[PDB]
């Protein structure tokens, strides 16, 4: 026999190990691979697909209504419409999105984000709104003047129903932790900032038209986005054997 010396690790079962092992059916011949549409090779292909943000996560909103950002004819100027932390992996409106689910399967992320909004009022309903991304350092902007100093887009309601605000990757480090859990890890360190929306002018409508309307909010990863360190999704759990 060839002299050998076995080492530490011998006999261990590392779940992420990658060895060759005997097959239960050494001569088995599988069915042929047939042509099936929609092959996916990497989940980055999935997170780049836009999905709805559960943005109106308030007590008065149930089910489907939680996807609608409320808009209404104003009687004052420069008012706020919505606010949200841009972090894709933290608890909140982003957690149930495609991007959020996969981000929650990992410990770190990087990349620009695509936030697209679609106005759903009548053809006659007009309006201009400003959507801003505030890089970290302080709290969310308190008014439109402060918000507009950051990255932003001014959206004009019209034939092209939607607008995209790209939240560019602006970070000290190449990656950020996906959680901002503070008590233990002090990960608030990684906060990516905020996205806020304000009336640029006002929502305006003809006589007897609905004075309230909705905006749907979409989010997806950009082509420079990636994830690292797989981890179990915190949303999936069980307390006992399943029926």
């Amino acid at each position: 026999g060839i002299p050998t010396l076995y080492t530490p690790g011998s006999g261990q079962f590392l779940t992420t190990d990658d060895f060759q092992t005997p097959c239960m059916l050494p001569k088995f011949q599988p069915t042929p691979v047939i042509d099936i549409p929609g092959e996916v090779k990497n989940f980055l292909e999935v997170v780049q697909v836009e999905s709805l943000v559960e943005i109106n996560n308030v007590e008065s909103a149930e089910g489907v209504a939680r996807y609608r950002i409320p808009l209404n004819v104003q009687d004052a100027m420069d008012g706020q419409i919505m606010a949200l932390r841009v972090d894709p992996g933290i608890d909140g409106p982003m957690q149930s999105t495609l991007l959020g689910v996969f981000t929650r399967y990992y410990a770190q992320w990087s990349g620009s984000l695509d936030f697209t909004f679609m106005f759903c009022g009548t053809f006659m309903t007009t309006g201009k709104v400003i959507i801003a991304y505030t890089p970290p350092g302080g709290d969310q902007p308190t008014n439109r003047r402060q918000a507009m100093l950051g990255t932003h887009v001014v959206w004009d309601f019209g034939l092209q129903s939607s607008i995209t605000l790209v939240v560019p990757w602006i970070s000290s480090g190449h990656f950020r932790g996906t959680t901002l859990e503070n008590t233990i890890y002090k990960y608030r360190y990684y906060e990516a900032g905020y996205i806020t929306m304000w009336y640029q002018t006002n929502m305006v409508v003809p006589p007897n038209f609905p004075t309230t309307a909705s905006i749907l909010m979409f989010v997806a990863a950009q082509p420079n986005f990636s994830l690292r360190i797989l981890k179990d999704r915190p949303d999936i759990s069980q307390e006992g054997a399943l029926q």
Partner: protein, 48 residues
């Protein structure tokens, strides 16, 4: 990252015995992100 040099010899008869695949690339996501018939260029308006 991954080694540019490493041993990859199969000791078993069936491919099912082999270690994990080592490709790991991604592909353009258009079949999922933009499954449309008409091209809508980034610089133009989507509908006319």
């Amino acid at each position: 990252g991954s080694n540019i040099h490493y041993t990859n010899i199969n000791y078993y008869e069936n491919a099912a015995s082999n270690s994990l695949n080592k490709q790991d690339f991604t592909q353009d996501p258009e079949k999922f992100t933009r499954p449309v018939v008409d091209v809508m260029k980034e610089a133009a308006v989507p509908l006319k």
